[PDB]
Scaffold this active site. Structure first.
Site, PDB file in Angstrom:
ATOM      1  NE  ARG A  62     -75.134 -22.309  34.224  1.00 43.64           N
ATOM      2  CZ  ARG A  62     -74.695 -20.985  34.007  1.00 43.64           C
ATOM      3  NH1 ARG A  62     -73.567 -21.553  33.466  1.00 43.64           N
ATOM      4  NH2 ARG A  62     -74.616 -20.242  34.315  1.00 43.64           N
ATOM      5  NE  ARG A  73     -75.535 -14.211  34.931  1.00 42.96           N
ATOM      6  CZ  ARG A  73     -74.047 -13.536  34.754  1.00 42.96           C
ATOM      7  NH1 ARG A  73     -74.517 -11.633  34.681  1.00 42.96           N
ATOM      8  NH2 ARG A  73     -73.153 -13.769  34.975  1.00 42.96           N
TER       9      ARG A  73
HETATM   10  N1  LIG Z   1     -76.301 -25.141  31.101  1.00 40.62           N
HETATM   11  C1  LIG Z   1     -76.729 -24.159  30.789  1.00 40.62           C
HETATM   12  N2  LIG Z   1     -78.587 -23.994  30.611  1.00 40.62           N
HETATM   13  C2  LIG Z   1     -78.950 -23.102  30.771  1.00 40.62           C
HETATM   14  N3  LIG Z   1     -78.555 -21.937  30.496  1.00 40.62           N
HETATM   15  C3  LIG Z   1     -77.369 -21.753  30.466  1.00 40.62           C
HETATM   16  C4  LIG Z   1     -76.295 -22.838  30.519  1.00 40.62           C
HETATM   17  N4  LIG Z   1     -75.271 -22.307  30.266  1.00 40.62           N
HETATM   18  C5  LIG Z   1     -75.228 -20.899  30.427  1.00 40.62           C
HETATM   19  N5  LIG Z   1     -76.371 -20.300  29.828  1.00 40.62           N
HETATM   20  C6  LIG Z   1     -77.201 -19.472  29.255  1.00 40.62           C
HETATM   21  O1  LIG Z   1     -76.408 -18.194  29.232  1.00 40.62           O
HETATM   22  C7  LIG Z   1     -75.375 -17.614  30.246  1.00 40.62           C
HETATM   23  C8  LIG Z   1     -74.557 -17.207  30.634  1.00 40.62           C
HETATM   24  O2  LIG Z   1     -73.929 -18.173  30.722  1.00 40.62           O
HETATM   25  P1  LIG Z   1     -72.679 -18.269  31.453  1.00 40.62           P
HETATM   26  O3  LIG Z   1     -71.409 -16.912  29.752  1.00 40.62           O
HETATM   27  O4  LIG Z   1     -72.219 -19.886  32.268  1.00 40.62           O
HETATM   28  O5  LIG Z   1     -72.394 -16.526  32.503  1.00 40.62           O
HETATM   29  C9  LIG Z   1     -77.108 -17.675  31.496  1.00 40.62           C
HETATM   30  O6  LIG Z   1     -77.510 -16.876  32.482  1.00 40.62           O
HETATM   31  C10 LIG Z   1     -77.808 -18.532  30.602  1.00 40.62           C
HETATM   32  O7  LIG Z   1     -78.781 -17.981  30.352  1.00 40.62           O
END
Ligand SMILES: Nc1ncnc2c1ncn2[C@@H]1O[C@H](COP(=O)(O)O)[C@@H](O)[C@H]1O
Ligand SMILES: Nc1ncnc2c1ncn2[C@@H]1O[C@H](COP(=O)(O)OP(=O)(O)O)[C@@H](O)[C@H]1O
Ligand SMILES: [Zn+2]
Length: 215
Positions: free
Chosen positions: A88, A171
């Site tokens: 990301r 987000r």
């Molecule tokens: N590759 C990543 N780098 C940094 N934070 C991450 C990443 N993937 C997930 N997160 C953290 O996990 C949260 C939930 O991710 P998601 O489940 O993909 O929506 C995000 O808002 C970030 O705080």
């Protein structure tokens, strides 16, 4: 089959990841899932990750890369893997390049699931996910067979803390900021494929299968 799914929050990566792993049998590696697991476990890493996640901010690259490297070292990743929501940041994509040099592997595709911003709020506010396996449902567009219960394992469905409109808007900003640098990075490597995510769930999957059949 070495794959990345990328896309803004709510674009359908988890949804498609579930379908990819059922069909092909490679591991689902979701950084979001791992962090939520860590926070549920109450690990030192989870408690540090919680503060960023609660704000809709990204967890620092060092922590994120660390968890992914360890996950990728497991035996189940030797025949391939699906990275969902990592990388990301361009720093994470650079790290992944090196990691994969060490594993003697390369990405087959980075699948970018594109959905217009305006649609993502509704996807996220109707999202419900399973407590026990993390399967993703939507109250309108993809409901469970039985209200509030996971189809796969009977776990309770819940609304993520971060799927509220204030946190969602942060987000979307945070993740949009990183998107063009990542698109440009993988476009330069020639492995970026864009998928129209504003289609039927099974239509989106049909398009991915068209990419993956060859590997
Ligand atoms: N590759 C990543 N780098 C940094 N934070 C991450 C990443 N993937 C997930 N997160 C953290 O996990 C949260 C939930 O991710 P998601 O489940 O993909 O929506 C995000 O808002 C970030 O705080
Ligand atoms: N093609 C689609 N059409 C309508 N709703 C979708 C589609 N793909 C996913 N959804 C739903 O929208 C929400 C976001 O999907 P999800 O896979 O969790 O997104 P991501 O993992 O990209 O954040 C979920 O509630 C999910 O059931
Ligand atoms: Zn479940």
């Amino acid at each position: 089959m070495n794959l990345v799914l990328m896309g803004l929050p709510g674009a359908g990566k988890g949804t498609q990841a579930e379908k990819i792993v059922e069909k092909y049998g490679i591991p689902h590696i979701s950084t979001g899932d791992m962090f939520r697991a860590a926070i549920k476990e109450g690990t030192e890493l989870g408690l540090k990750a919680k503060s960023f996640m609660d704000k809709g901010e990204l967890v620092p690259d060092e922590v994120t890369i660390g968890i992914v490297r360890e996950r990728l070292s497991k035996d189940d990743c030797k025949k391939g893997f699906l990275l969902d929501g990592f990388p990301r940041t361009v720093a994470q994509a650079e790290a992944l390049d090196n990691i994969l040099s060490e594993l003697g592997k390369k990405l087959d595709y980075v699948i970018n699931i594109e959905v217009p911003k305006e649609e993502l709020m509704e996807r996220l506010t109707g999202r419900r996910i399973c407590k026990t396996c993390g399967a993703t449902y939507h109250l309108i567009f993809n409901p469970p067979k039985v209200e509030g219960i996971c189809d796969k394992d009977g776990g309770e469905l819940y609304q993520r803390a971060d799927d509220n409109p204030e946190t969602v808007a942060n987000r979307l900003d945070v993740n949009m900021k990183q998107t063009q640098p990542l698109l440009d990075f993988y476009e330069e490597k020639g492995v970026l494929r864009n998928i129209d995510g504003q289609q039927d769930i099974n239509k989106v999957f049909a398009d991915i299968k068209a990419l993956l059949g060859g590997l």
